[PDB]
Design a protein around this ligand. Structure first.
Ligand SMILES: *[C@@H]1O[C@H](CO)[C@@H](O[C@@H]2O[C@H](CO)[C@@H](O[C@H]3O[C@H](CO[C@H]4O[C@H](CO)[C@@H](O)[C@H](O[C@H]5O[C@H](CO)[C@@H](O)[C@H](O)[C@@H]5O[C@H]5O[C@H](CO)[C@@H](O)[C@H](O)[C@@H]5O)[C@@H]4O)[C@@H](O)[C@H](O[C@H]4O[C@H](CO)[C@@H](O)[C@H](O)[C@@H]4O[C@H]4O[C@H](CO)[C@@H](O)[C@H](O)[C@@H]4O)[C@@H]3O)[C@H](O)[C@H]2NC(C)=O)[C@H](O)[C@H]1NC(C)=O
Ligand SMILES: CS(=O)(=O)N1Cc2cnc(N[C@H]3Cc4cc(Cl)cc(C#N)c4C3)nc2C1
Ligand SMILES: [Ca+2]
Ligand SMILES: [Ca+2]
Ligand SMILES: [K+]
Ligand code: NA
Ligand SMILES: [Zn+2]
Length: 804
């Protein structure tokens, strides 16, 4: 209940919201049906529209008018945004030459440059080029400020998940807004775009920027606007707030536009009806910038122009129906559209079986337009699993398609031509970033980056300490003229052991065999040098990775590779090796097919054993340094050490052997050498973070050898490919992957074919950032380079996306 009989007199767009039953006058009161009875009359004036005309110049103030053109309007802070152009002979901001903003040029009383976020819904990255002729204000921000060719959203590429990620720096799995529709089984409560449940604070985790500001003594404008408040009124409200007294005035603001998303759903991303929404957004940017110029704030404020996600062509005919796959379609609940989420319709139904649902949805139709996953098996780059609001069964829907439960869902609820929500690496889902102002760089292009990184920068722009988040603070320092964040590398927690030869062959009872009895002080000296690390500078190009947790591990040197060997997990944490462009691929010799060799540097008690693999009928083994890329027949024996072995399902060995035998050489050929760091990952609780030993759910039968959930590789070369990877003077280039260690190839519908037709497609889907592997391993890479630490942080956030 609300006492609407109160009044908004002197309260219009008040910044602190009052508590029920008191009536409200803030920018969200309409959304709560709680505005005072006189809110429209006092706070949403429309009379005479939004623009000064020559006849209004120097008018007697009429308080009924939407905006003013009276001599007192700049003093009151309520001029129409074109007042000085129409009435005082000024230019529009967009008609002024770009002039570098080297320092903030702020009115007396401004303690810091304000930040204004201009957020646009559904603004696809390619609109910046394709719509340039109709967006002059936006094109001036873009060309004169700092811009990226695109900004990568989070998955799912829906509105609330992405806006709340912009606000928090968190993945959706961490902030809790995992879709635009959600069921929380602990709350037994449903979140929808329509209705009141979504206003309950229990949905919204993390700490959004307006809370971070307020807690640190920086005042914020409210970021949410009720839909019926016209954009012109939103702009005039921001400009009026910027005219408040110093002690009352916010330092951070947000504008929001529902366009171009609203029209893009109706007309498609490039429908001819899309030009007018782009022109209208541009005009709104112009009102803001002319308004700031009037207030002498246009060389004071930092402006961010940012979108939440893009927009794809999607029509009602491109819908897959689960009723064409499942016997049991009435026993499931589907969250449908550009992603699927499946759970039981009733938790009382004991016949419900996720395994039979997955199997019925797997590679059943030749051009099937979705792929089912258990959420832990989703590509790790999506970071879409560690939340009870994310159903165990997920459908990744192909771009341009929908999934629905039954056909009647699509026509008993069409005409739409656009949608979004797909995999956040899809080109059509990419969105925009421009930063303009004193704290941003001038006429600067930056590479694409992820929207999780922006919260830290907005905190930098406001002098705030960010709440703990999933950005990598410093990775976006190259956007900024000033207020850079200069972190120190994390401290190494565990120092390695450097074991020498300590064990005789006969002390090992591992059940291993190798045909390696083949008896020269020239080479015997060389053998010793290689075991002491004489080739380590070729194979360890960027320093030893640092271990950022407490453990026991050994550095093991070899002719062709170096490893950090865990005495706790009985296998390497990392294996590092360099493959030149000139490297030769060889076979595993016939006599060595089943060769495994004890490592006389490592105790039998801290070694794997071959008998466990013989007894475990499901599990086989592979090697981290590939025997195919040995430098010589003699060096190849090192590759068969028990300390280089890792557990691998036979199905996974098809993937891994193709990577090692074909793809590493291909990348060395293409990139002018590569350095490879490979290793295991254990994430049985799918939280994106290194498991401790007591979290491991599977061992090699009858042993303490833990089974990885994933295998990674980090593949580094010189960005200037005219220099070989091992003699690179400048910036680096990286690609990485986190491959799921699965006992079948059910994810790859063409896996019956030769690996040349499916394995690289699998690896592209599971592309990763170095930072993703850092979280999953507790390792810190690139500790010893010639490069600035912020440049290395940017490299660690890079994702190789494999889009055209
Ligand atoms: C992205 O960046 C984020 C932010 O840095 C980071 O997430 C942080 O990860 C930490 C490890 O998973 C975790 O640390 C402690 O969490 C709780 C305290 O949690 C509450 O308080 C904080 C601080 O204000 C809140 O932010 C937090 O919000 C979460 O829960 C809300 C209510 O559910 C929810 O609204 C909100 O969205 C958020 O949920 C998310 O995180 C939770 C986990 O907290 C997930 O479950 C959700 O699915 C969702 O993902 C809370 O209100 C501490 O209690 C923990 O300590 C445990 O566990 C330790 C084990 O290592 C142990 O040593 C401790 O003794 C203690 O154990 C006890 O409890 C166990 C579990 O119940 C029990 O089994 C055991 O026997 C014993 O009794 C953690 O130290 C942070 O909460 C988390 N923050 C946020 C914001 O998510 C992400 O990891 C990265 N991502 C990547 C990939 O890098
Ligand atoms: C889903 S929707 O259509 O129902 N909807 C209505 C509505 C109203 N105002 C806004 N304002 C945005 C402006 C902004 C900027 C940044 Cl950086 C982070 C966040 C967050 N968080 C927001 C909220 N957004 C929406 C999204
Ligand atoms: Ca949106
Ligand atoms: Ca984990
Ligand atoms: K076996
Ligand atoms: Na298959
Ligand atoms: Zn939309």
């Amino acid at each position: 209940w609300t006492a609407t009989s109160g009044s908004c007199k002197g309260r219009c767009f008040e910044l602190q919201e009052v508590g029920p039953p008191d009536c409200r006058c803030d920018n969200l009161c309409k959304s709560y049906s709680s505005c005072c009875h006189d809110f429209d009359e006092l706070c949403l004036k429309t009379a005479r529209g939004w623009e000064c005309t020559k006849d209004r110049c120097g008018e007697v103030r009429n308080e009924e008018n939407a905006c003013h053109c009276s001599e007192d309007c700049l003093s009151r802070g309520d001029c129409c945004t074109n007042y000085q152009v129409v009435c005082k002979g000024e230019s529009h901001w967009v008609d002024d030459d770009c002039e570098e903003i080297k320092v903030p040029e702020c009115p007396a009383g401004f303690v810091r440059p304000p930040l204004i976020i201009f957020s646009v819904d559904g603004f696809r990255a390619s609109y910046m080029k394709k719509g340039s002729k109709v967006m002059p204000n936006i094109e001036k921000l873009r060309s004169c400020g700092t811009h990226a060719p695109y900004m990568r959203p989070v998955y799912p590429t829906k509105t609330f998940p992405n806006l709340y990620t912009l606000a928090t720096g968190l993945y959706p799995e961490s902030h809790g807004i995992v879709g635009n529709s959600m069921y929380d089984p602990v709350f037994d409560a449903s979140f929808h775009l329509r209705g009141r449940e979504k206003f309950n604070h229990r949905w919204w985790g993390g700490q959004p920027l307006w809370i971070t500001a307020t807690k640190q003594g920086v005042r914020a404008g409210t970021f949410f606007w009720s839909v019926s408040i016209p954009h012109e009124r939103r702009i005039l409200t921001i400009l009026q707030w910027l005219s408040l007294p110093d002690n009352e005035r916010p330092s951070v603001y947000a504008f929001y536009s529902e366009q171009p998303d609203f029209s893009g759903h109706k007309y498609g991303p490039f429908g001819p009806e899309m030009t007018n929404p782009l022109r209208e957004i541009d005009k709104t940017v112009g009102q803001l910038m002319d308004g700031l110029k009037q207030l002498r704030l246009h060389r004071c404020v930092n402006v961010i122009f940012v979108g939440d996600h893009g927009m794809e062509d999607v029509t009602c005919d491109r819908t897959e129906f689960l009723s064409n796959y499942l016997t049991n379609v009435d026993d499931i609940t589907l969250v449908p559209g550009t992603l699927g989420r499946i759970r039981a319709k009733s938790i009382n139904n004991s016949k419900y079986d996720p395994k039979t649902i997955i199997a019925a949805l797997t590679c059943k139709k030749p051009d099937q337009h979705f792929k089912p996953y258990m959420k832990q098996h989703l590509p790790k780059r999506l970071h879409y699993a560690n939340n009870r609001r994310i159903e165990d069964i997920h459908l990744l829907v192909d771009r341009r398609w929908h999934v629905a439960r039954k056909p009647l869902d699509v026509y008993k609820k069409c005409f739409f031509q656009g949608d979004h929500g797909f995999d956040n690496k899809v080109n059509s889902m990419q969105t925009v970033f421009v930063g303009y102002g004193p704290t941003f760089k001038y006429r600067t292009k930056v590479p694409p980056f992820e929207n999780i990184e922006l919260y830290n920068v907005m905190c930098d722009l406001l002098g705030l300490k960010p709440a703990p988040n999933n950005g990598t603070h410093g990775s976006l320092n190259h956007l900024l003229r000033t207020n850079t964040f200069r972190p120190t590398m994390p401290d190494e927690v565990s120092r390695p052991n450097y074991p020498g030869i300590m064990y005789l062959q006969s002390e090992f009872d591992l059940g291993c065999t190798c045909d390696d009895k083949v008896e020269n002080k020239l080479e015997e000296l060389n053998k010793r040098l290689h075991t002491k690390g004489s080739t380590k500078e070729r194979h360890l190009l960027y320093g030893r990775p640092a271990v950022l947790y407490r453990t026991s591990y050994d550095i093991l040197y070899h002719t062709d590779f170096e490893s950090g060997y865990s005495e706790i997990f009985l296998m390497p944490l990392w294996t590092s090796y360099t493959i030149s462009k000139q490297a030769e691929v060889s076979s595993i010799p016939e006599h060595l097919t089943n060769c495994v060799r004890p490592d006389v540097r490592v105790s039998p008690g801290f070694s794997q054993n071959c008998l466990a693999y013989k007894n475990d009928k499901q599990m086989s083994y592979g090697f981290l340094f590939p025997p195919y890329l040995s430098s010589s027949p003699e060096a190849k024996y090192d590759a068969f050490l028990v300390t280089n072995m890792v557990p691998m399902y036979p199905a996974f060995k098809r993937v891994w052997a193709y990577f090692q035998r074909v793809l590493v050489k291909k990348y060395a050929s293409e990139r002018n050498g590569v350095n490879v760091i490979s290793g295991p990952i254990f994430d049985y609780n799918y939280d994106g973070l290194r498991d401790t030993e007591d979290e491991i759910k599977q061992y090699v039968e009858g042993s303490s050898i833990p089974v990885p959930t994933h295998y990674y590789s980090i593949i580094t070369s010189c960005l200037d490919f005219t220099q070989p990877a091992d003699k690179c003077d400048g910036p680096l280039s990286v690609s990485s992957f986190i491959l799921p260690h699965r006992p079948d190839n059910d994810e790859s519908c063409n896996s019956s074919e030769d690996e040349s037709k499916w394995v690289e497609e699998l690896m592209k889907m599971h592309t990763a950032r170095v930072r993703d592997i850092e979280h999953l391993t507790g390792l810190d890479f690139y500790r010893k380079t010639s490069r600035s630490y912020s440049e290395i942080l940017t490299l660690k956030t890079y994702l190789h996306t494999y889009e055209s």
